Ligand binder design. Structure first.
Ligand SMILES: Nc1ncnc2c1ncn2[C@@H]1O[C@H](COP(=O)(O)OP(=O)(O)OP(=O)(O)O)[C@@H](O)[C@H]1O
Ligand SMILES: Nc1ncnc2c1ncn2[C@@H]1O[C@H](COP(=O)(O)OP(=O)(O)OP(=O)(O)O)[C@@H](O)[C@H]1O
Ligand SMILES: Nc1ncnc2c1ncn2[C@@H]1O[C@H](COP(=O)(O)OP(=O)(O)O)[C@@H](O)[C@H]1O
Ligand SMILES: [Mg+2]
Ligand SMILES: [Mg+2]
Ligand SMILES: [Mg+2]
Lengths: 503, 48, 465, 42, 48, 469
């Protein structure tokens, strides 16, 4: 602390007034970093307020100055401006008043729909739940996609990474998961309701506006909170936005309800955090990232948990998004998030342009919850599907130069081709779990071997309609039983053969 | 096999014979011709 | 107040003030310079010293030279008086046609429009380029990026877009030459005065030119894109117009920022770039958008260094664009022009509910054949064409016919190619690729599909052989 | 999408020799001819 | 035998060309890795 | 003495003392703090200032806050009272079962046992895993490393080793959860309770758990491995027991040291790491050893970043282990579980004079067939299976039978797959692979060798396939 005014008043023995323990003055300001002299009673990661009305967070506490990141444009901050302590660390509004609202990283509404009447505020940096308060992940979290709910299942309380290149369908997976919860939120079952939270980090405001337009048209906005820290916002806002959205989802998790968080995308939050660390003169590491960039994502995603029945039983499900560069998952940030999350959904550009949409690489996509994240009917049909897809994987290569094949092998090749075309699905149309089970069950029991793969989608709509208004007793029978009995299997096969004769 | 386009083009010429003389039995010397042509005209193969 | 120069290192000048510091982004004017030298305040260093970035050359500057504070950021002329004129980064006219007499001025630093002022409507902008109109169609009002290396063709592609879209356009256009050839600026300027888009006689001009080229210092090259934005922002907001903004090229804005950042005392980021690469780009790119007041259709050429799409500057630009057009050197070396990569260009309007079911299915069908061709090309390279007899050879034959048919002669490339330029309606484009996908043209040679616009010229070329 | 055999070691499907580790299409050819022989045997 | 001889001759020439291009790609990537790793160490050392 | 906080930058806190300075590795406690934040002295900066790393979150720290020197390093409770309990990095009970009432405390920093105290006993530890028992057999009292990337099966393998060894071991066991998922720690805690290894009622608990997970700061994740090691060292030394030390994941000890090393004023090393990587790993690993007083059988899961075994953290760990089992993604993608690479996993007791001549010759014979299989795959790609001669036909056929037979269903993975778990004796493993090498089962299909424990189940599965088809 040796500046010319402070040095000179130390020579005179003036003992100056305006004591700098709850206040301070800016020494240097630039690139969103303000070095402030004073603020002696300040706390680490504490909010401050500048004389221009802007807010800031004190990250570096040093004997001479305080390193403060600026929540906005630093053109308003000037050298010698008065910085005041807020007195508390960063907190955001929480509650159900934020459902249907678009907010920034600090909780201020940006959709122009008026003030938010929230009653409670939680600090964004709470500690994750421990070993005791959480229970094993057991409830299915329905994405609505056949390739996800069967092969890479997601349970309530699980971090599942959606990783891929640019324009591979990562946002498509996340938005369709939010849209799929319309069925459960309309129903009377309070246990199966899911309140989604979408966090947009570093995107365009027109991209976020297109997201809100899609969610409002599908009426998914009533249970969705959109936290938006776009590219025009400051790097501290984009860094703070996943923790703000996590705190909003932690309100539902701690109150017995089930919430879903999408961080779209965490690769941009690392870029924002790298910019703050470099401009705070902290020494960089791999790809100029700070050392604590792993702890950045680990302390965020660990707060996604399935609480025990003594803590209300609520869950917090996280779907982080990571963008790779030409499929390089050996980079610093994709490697960290893969090692943190409970599973991955790899999306490949080669599969995307081969017609496979969603472009999920089944050989690279894992899920550490396994069959416990699936319902009983889905577990019965996805296990048989995983065996048949494994058998198809052994025999799918024969189309390269093979010409004569065994009759059983040809049946395996034909059924697996039907299954690969079964896993394809259009965008913005998530299907219910009963429809996914029924279509997959027909695919793995040979009910589609006589159908050309080009008409699989037409069969998927029309046959499901036929067993909906006419054979709804069978659907009630499966729902009450919870699985597929041999008698129900024979009944469904007879309806399939009757429908194929009429087809 | 894997000698080039030998068995593929010869079988292709044989396929043109199947579109010209569908009722002609064919005696093949080699399994590759049998592999290609059994799917199309397995009812018109004398011996391989 | 009045300051004095403390340090001059390249484009970065440190100025110390006595009474009151100018704010960040304020414009400072150096006194003893015969042309105007403008310094833009970047940061406060302490001890009443600010660190500035010069918009021109810093040679001849001495320490202690008086610097005047204008009290405002860089304000440039805006309005109808800028149409048909060429201005530099600081708004001075460089067309030697006198001053830009106007009452309207605007700072080149402005906040991006808020989330409320966003338009969600998407309509297809028909270009006349078959590869663009089919696989990655442009939105009428939206951000379009032209990724490519050096020589793959981005100036030619953006000049063809000016020739097709901007000539028949009910509105105004803005061209921002950012770190490109001054020869190209002279060629485009005389192209406008010859095509009538710029009128030197009366006030019927429709395009405003802003040029900071590759001979300019890094301060001018990192701010002249903001000057082109400010002219286009005035037309969108204060007049409600539909504006075209062509930027050639936006990588030079980021590259010039890295050159200044070396002298700003920052810890370098990945691949030697500035730490604020994404934030500076995001602040600039979010101002280029269509709001409820007016629409801006922006086409931005984007240079990739060393033909690397994983470089931080092109990679962060990908998320700012509705439609991307990635130009490949391998395609250009095959003689296919425009060298658009079919499996790397996206549109964000390639949707059955936006462009139609038949347009979407043909585009997805084309990409499926070309992706199957890329998978088979390793067998073709080492072993040869002997693979799967009828099936894979039909895939190769159709894909090579599609690759030839994606090529198209440009009207702006007619001087150095000889082939007449073709403007192809999008109905003829989807009809032409549907004929190739259906197998109706398997008997034609693949030379007949090359460098001809309509599919009727393909069969006419085949009959000529 | 299933990680076809011979597409690459750690790339979804593969594991074995240099061709199978490299993946691409020759690893697919190696897996195709090998699985065809052992399916004929069974 | 003639077709198999000229097919292996074409395959060996094409593999030889692919070896040369992959060798230059390997040399560029090896040099880029060394340069990038050293710049990261220098940046960490200079930031202290 | 008493000190005051000078700087707080990340997980690194600089504190200044007026009296005598605390030594390096001493434990400091922040006074005006509710969850008992603890700082560990890392270096003396001069001018009566020491630089520390925080064992908990640093939010809310104020410059000038009083810090108290405890006069000793971090001391944790040790003894039988830690059995069936969960401890954090600083020894506080995090299982919500009240305080750990005990009389013995041990510092988590200690010197490694000397060269005179080293034991050269090497006897094979039978685990029931066929690829582990045959190719890279574990030794009692030796160090075991489970190398692998993300998702290859290190956690499932270390859960299977706990099920097969620690349930009927005899003597205490210690699990150290270092920088992993809290869900996995909750899953293991309830699996131990259901298995009876943890008793919530009686004193018959066998395993002591220490957990510092991904949500912990880098200071806690870089010291929690020393906390679990201190519990294992007390059981080895002060009780003479045979101790099982399961660590997952030991890479997080290295990674958490690299996160704070930049803020400690250190130039980065190659790739990017602390310059003290080999020394910090060496001091930690050489405490985990079999003394002449007692034996510690250590099984450590080792994360391989981006599946690059030449990364400096897995590469330095190889020299510290008697047996290393490398889990490969290529093996896992084929469906083979466990995904142990047969040509990358080594053991020190893989000797003719330790495991017998028949065990050694079959293991070397298996590795020779699998190596020739990799060499032959390039000829298969170009020449095809048609032109290979009957010798290479038998090499490929027996290699695929061997490669399928290395897979095995796990009891802890039964909920994942549905296959019942199987435990295989070492004698049945040697006999089963000898039959495949001799060619006694050349008429069997290769699908009969997939996910079956003994070779008698291979014959039964082949008969079932033949009868059904
Ligand atoms: N299952 C699908 N079927 C059809 N089109 C799809 C599907 N999934 C995604 N798409 C389309 O592919 C394009 C890219 O997908 P999306 O934008 O979701 O990917 P992304 O990885 O989020 O891209 P970005 O890198 O721009 O964020 C969009 O035009 C989207 O409509
Ligand atoms: N559509 C086209 N038709 C024919 N030739 C073309 C076309 N586009 C580009 N070329 C060729 O490529 C050259 C490069 O043109 P252009 O200036 O557009 O490239 P660029 O990407 O802007 O490169 P630079 O980095 O030099 O600005 C042309 O002079 C011409 O030879
Ligand atoms: N022995 C096994 N049998 C079957 N699947 C396994 C086995 N081991 C691992 N897996 C697969 O790996 C996933 C869990 O991997 P895990 O052990 O958590 O990896 P890591 O040890 O790297 O965390 C499971 O979803 C499962 O599908
Ligand atoms: Mg997206
Ligand atoms: Mg150009
Ligand atoms: Mg693990």
């Amino acid at each position: 602390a040796e500046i010319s005014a402070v040095l000179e008043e130390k020579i005179l023995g003036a003992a100056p007034k305006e004591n700098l323990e709850e206040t301070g003055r800016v020494l240097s300001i630039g690139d969103g970093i303000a070095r402030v002299y004073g603020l002696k009673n300040i706390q680490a990661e504490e909010m401050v307020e500048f004389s221009s009305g802007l807010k800031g967070m004190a990250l570096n506490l040093e004997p001479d100055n305080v390193g403060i990141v600026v929540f906005g444009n630093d053109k308003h901050i000037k050298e010698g401006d008065i910085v005041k302590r807020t007195g508390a660390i960063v907190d955001v509004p929480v509650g159900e008043e934020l459902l249907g609202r678009v907010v920034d990283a600090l909780g201020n509404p940006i959709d122009g729909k008026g003030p938010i009447g929230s009653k409670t505020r939680q600090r964004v940096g709470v500690k994750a739940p421990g070993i005791i308060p959480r229970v094993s992940v057991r409830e299915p979290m329905q994405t609505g996609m056949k390739a996800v709910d069967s092969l890479v299942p997601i349970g309530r309380g699980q971090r599942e990474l959606i990783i891929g290149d640019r324009q591979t369908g990562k946002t498509a997976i996340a938005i369709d998961a939010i849209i799929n919860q319309k069925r459960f939120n309309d129903a009377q079952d309070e246990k199966k309701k899911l309140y989604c939270v979408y966090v947009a980090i570093g995107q365009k405001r027109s991209t976020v506006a297109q997201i809100v337009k899609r969610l409002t048209d599908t009426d998914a906005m009533r249970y969705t909170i959109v936290v938006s820290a776009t590219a025009s916002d400051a790097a501290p806002l984009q860094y703070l936005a996943p923790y703000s959205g996590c705190a909003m989802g932690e309100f539902f998790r701690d109150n017995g309800k089930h919430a879903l968080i999408i961080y779209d995308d965490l690769s941009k939050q690392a870029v924002a955090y790298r910019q703050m660390s470099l401009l705070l003169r902290r020494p960089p590491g791999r790809e100029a990232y700070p050392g604590d960039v792993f702890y950045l994502h680990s302390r965020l995603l660990e707060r996604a948990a399935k609480m025990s029945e003594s803590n209300g039983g609520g869950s917090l499900t996280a779907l982080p998004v990571i963008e790779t560069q030409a499929g390089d998952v050996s980079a610093y940030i994709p490697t960290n998030v893969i090692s943190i999350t409970d599973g991955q959904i790899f999306l490949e550009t080669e599969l995307f342009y081969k017609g496979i949409r969603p472009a999920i690489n089944v050989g690279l996509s894992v899920s550490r919850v396994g069959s416990a994240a699936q319902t009983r009917a889905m577990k019965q049909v996805a296990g048989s599907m995983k065996l048949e897809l494994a058998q198809y994987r052994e025999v799918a290569a024969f189309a390269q130069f093979g010409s004569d094949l065994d009759a059983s092998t040809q049946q395996l090749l034909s059924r697996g081709v039907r299954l690969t075309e079964l896993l394809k699905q259009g965008q913005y149309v998530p299907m219910a779990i009963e429809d996914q089970v029924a279509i997959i069950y027909c695919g793995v029991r040979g009910h589609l071997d006589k159908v050309e793969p080009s008409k699989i989608t037409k069969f998927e709509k029309e046959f499901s309609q036929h067993i909906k208004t006419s054979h709804r007793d069978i659907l009630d029978t499966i729902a009450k039983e919870g699985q597929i009995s041999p008698d129900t299997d024979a009944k469904l096969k007879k309806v399939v053969t009757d429908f194929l004769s009429t087809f | 096999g894997l000698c080039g386009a030998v068995h593929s083009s010869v079988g292709r010429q044989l396929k043109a014979d199947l579109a010209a003389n569908p009722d002609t039995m064919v005696i093949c010397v080699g399994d590759k011709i049998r592999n290609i042509l059994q799917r199309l005209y397995g009812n018109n193969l004398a011996m391989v | 107040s009045n300051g004095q120069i403390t340090a001059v290192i390249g484009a970065v000048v440190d100025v110390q003030f006595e009474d009151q510091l100018p704010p960040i982004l304020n414009a400072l004017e150096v006194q003893g310079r015969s042309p105007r030298l403008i310094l833009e305040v970047a940061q406060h260093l302490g001890e009443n010293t600010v660190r500035t970035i010069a918009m021109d050359g810093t040679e001849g500057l001495v320490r202690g030279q008086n610097v005047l504070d204008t009290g405002a950021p860089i304000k440039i002329p805006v309005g109808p008086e800028t149409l048909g004129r060429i201005m530099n980064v600081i708004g001075e006219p460089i067309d030697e046609r006198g001053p830009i007499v106007t009452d309207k001025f605007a700072a080149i630093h402005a906040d991006a429009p808020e989330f409320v002022e966003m338009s969600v409507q998407q309509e297809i902008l028909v270009t006349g380029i078959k590869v663009v109109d089919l696989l990655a169609p442009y939105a009428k009002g939206g951000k379009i990026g032209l990724f490519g290396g050096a020589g793959v063709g981005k100036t030619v592609l953006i000049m063809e877009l000016i020739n097709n879209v901007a000539k028949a356009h009910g509105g105004y256009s803005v061209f921002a030459g950012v770190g490109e050839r001054t020869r190209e600026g002279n060629d485009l300027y005389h192209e406008m005065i010859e095509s009538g888009v710029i009128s030197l006689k009366d006030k019927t001009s429709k395009v405003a030119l802003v040029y900071g080229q590759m001979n300019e210092p890094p301060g001018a090259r990192a701010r002249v894109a903001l000057t082109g934005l400010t002219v286009a922002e005035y037309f969108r907001d204060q007049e409600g117009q539909d504006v075209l903004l062509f930027i050639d090229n936006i990588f030079r804005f980021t590259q010039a920022g890295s050159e200044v950042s070396a002298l700003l005392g920052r810890i370098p980021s990945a691949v030697g770039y500035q730490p604020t690469l994404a934030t500076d780009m995001g602040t600039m790119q979010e101002r280029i958008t269509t709001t409820k007041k007016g629409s801006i259709t922006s086409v931005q050429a984007i240079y990739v260094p060393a033909d690397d799409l994983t470089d931080p500057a092109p990679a962060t630009t990908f998320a700012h664009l509705d439609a991307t057009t990635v130009l490949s050197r391998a395609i250009a070396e095959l003689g296919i022009y425009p060298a658009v990569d079919p499996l790397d260009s996206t549109s964000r309007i390639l949707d059955p509910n936006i462009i139609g079911e038949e347009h979407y299915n043909i585009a997805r069908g084309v990409q499926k054949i070309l992706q199957d061709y890329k998978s088979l090309q390793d067998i073709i390279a080492i072993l040869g064409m002997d693979e799967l007899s009828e099936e894979d050879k039909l895939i190769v034959s159709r894909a090579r016919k599609i690759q030839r048919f994606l090529s198209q002669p440009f009207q702006v490339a007619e001087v150095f190619t000889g082939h007449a330029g073709k403007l192809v309606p999008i109905k003829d484009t989807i009809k032409g690729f549907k004929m190739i996908l259906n197998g109706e043209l398997d008997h034609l040679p693949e030379v007949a599909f090359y460098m001809v616009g309509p599919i009727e010229e393909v069969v006419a070329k085949a009959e000529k052989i | 999408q299933l990680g076809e055999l011979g597409t690459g070691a750690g790339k979804g499907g593969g594991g074995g020799g240099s061709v199978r580790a490299a993946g691409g299409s020759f690893g697919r050819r190696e897996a195709a001819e090998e699985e065809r022989y052992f399916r004929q045997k069974e | 035998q003639s077709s198999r001889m000229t097919a292996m001759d074409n395959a060996s020439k094409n593999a030889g060309e692919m070896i040369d291009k992959l060798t230059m790609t390997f040399n560029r990537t090896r040099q880029a890795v060394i340069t990038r790793e050293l710049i990261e160490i220098i940046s960490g050392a200079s930031a202290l």
